[PDB]
Structure formats: C-alpha cells, structure tokens
Amino acid sequence: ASLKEIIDELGKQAKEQNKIASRILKIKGIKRIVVQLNAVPQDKIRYSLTIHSQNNFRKQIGITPQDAEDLKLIAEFLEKYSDFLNEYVKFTP
Amino acid sequence: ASLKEIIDELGKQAKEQNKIASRILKIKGIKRIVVQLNAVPQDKIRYSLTIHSQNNFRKQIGITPQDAEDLKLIAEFLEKYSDFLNEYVKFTP
Structure with a gap:
C-alpha cells in the first residue's frame, strides 16, 4: 500500500463511519517509534x-x-511527501 | 536554567509530591512543537x-x-545531551 492508497482508504472509511479511521504507516528504518x-x-x-x-x-x-x-x-518522510500531501489532503489545524 | 538544573528541580518536586512534575524545555529554533x-x-x-x-x-x-x-x-537536542542524560538520569522503560 502506497501512502495515497492508505490516505484514500482511511478517508473512505472515516466518511462511511463518521469516526476516526487510523492505520500504521510502515516507514522504512524506524526502530521503535x-x-x-x-x-x-x-x-x-x-x-x-x-x-x-x-x-x-x-x-x-x-x-x-x-x-x-x-x-x-519521520522528519525525512514528511519532507519527501510534503508537496504531494499539501495538494492531496488537508491536515488538522 | 540548564537542562541539569531543570532535571534536578523536576526530580526534587516529583519526589516531594509523589506525582508527575513537568516543565517545558525551551529548545532553540523550534517553531511549533x-x-x-x-x-x-x-x-x-x-x-x-x-x-x-x-x-x-x-x-x-x-x-x-x-x-x-x-x-x-528535537533529534539533535537528544543527541547533543545523550551521553550526559544516560549517565545522569533514567528514563521510562
């Protein structure tokens, strides 16, 4: 599952249920967090x-x-996807 | 207040009160977190x-x-103080 794909699945699920939809992001190299x-x-x-x-x-x-x-x-993940994310979705204020 | 000084004050306070003692660390350059x-x-x-x-x-x-x-x-702060911290205090498991 690509990020976009997870985004799309969580948006769909959250809309259908009117509650928080969550999923763990399996970012490579992260040891503990x-x-x-x-x-x-x-x-x-x-x-x-x-x-x-x-x-x-x-x-x-x-x-x-x-x-x-x-x-x-995590910082590096955010920067790598920043441009996509800021076009593709909206974040909590 | 140096880190050590804040550590010492929070340890003292937590011991005297038997509850969590907290303080904001004023780490330079952090914009929002x-x-x-x-x-x-x-x-x-x-x-x-x-x-x-x-x-x-x-x-x-x-x-x-x-x-x-x-x-x-934050990562850089942790690395800069890592050696001191790991001698000076113990963290939550």
Whole structure:
C-alpha cells in the first residue's frame, strides 16, 4: 500500500463511519517509534500523524534519547511527501 | 536554567509530591512543537520527553509535514545531551 492508497482508504472509511479511521504507516528504518495516520471527520476529513510506543501503544509516547534517529527518519518522510500531501489532503489545524 | 538544573528541580518536586512534575524545555529554533520534560515517580524517578501542540496543548499532538524541521531539531537536542542524560538520569522503560 502506497501512502495515497492508505490516505484514500482511511478517508473512505472515516466518511462511511463518521469516526476516526487510523492505520500504521510502515516507514522504512524506524526502530521503535510507531507512526500512525489518522483521518478525522468534522463536517470534512482532516489528517494527522501521531506517534506511539510499542510498550504503551494507547498512551502518549515518552521520548528518550535513543529515539533521535527515528525522529529524523519521520522528519525525512514528511519532507519527501510534503508537496504531494499539501495538494492531496488537508491536515488538522 | 540548564537542562541539569531543570532535571534536578523536576526530580526534587516529583519526589516531594509523589506525582508527575513537568516543565517545558525551551529548545532553540523550534517553531511549533512544544517539548516538555517530565519526572515520573514509581517506587524511583523516571524521565520522559513529551511533545505537544500550542493549539491543543493537553491533547495528543497531530504532526503535519510542516513539523519536519522541529522534529530534526528535537533529534539533535537528544543527541547533543545523550551521553550526559544516560549517565545522569533514567528514563521510562
């Protein structure tokens, strides 16, 4: 599944259910942080990326120094898809 | 306030109160993401860094492509202090 494909599936699902539709993005090279894409309905669908631990998935992530490389890789993912994303979808304000 | 100084103040406060003691870390160059250091008591004090939005401070942050640079700067902060931190404190597992 390409990013676009996941976007499209999560938008569809969120629209049909009128609730948050989420999916883990399998970004290469990330060791510990789990990245999840969410489609959030309002009126309208808005997207966000949330980060998560493995150990306490539903809780808020507690970052440690060992997450530095993961964080850079998330940053790089965002830049690589930035132009596409900003044309293709709208994010939570 | 140096990092060590904030660490020491948050450890002291968390120990005296038996509850989470938090403080925003004023890391230079970060535009939007708010970084907060937390001291969490168990038995023992464990530290975490959490990230936050300005707009929905208490909610979970929804990352967007515009946060890429902030994320890199957090990564760089973590690497710059990594050796000190891993000697000086213990993190949430």
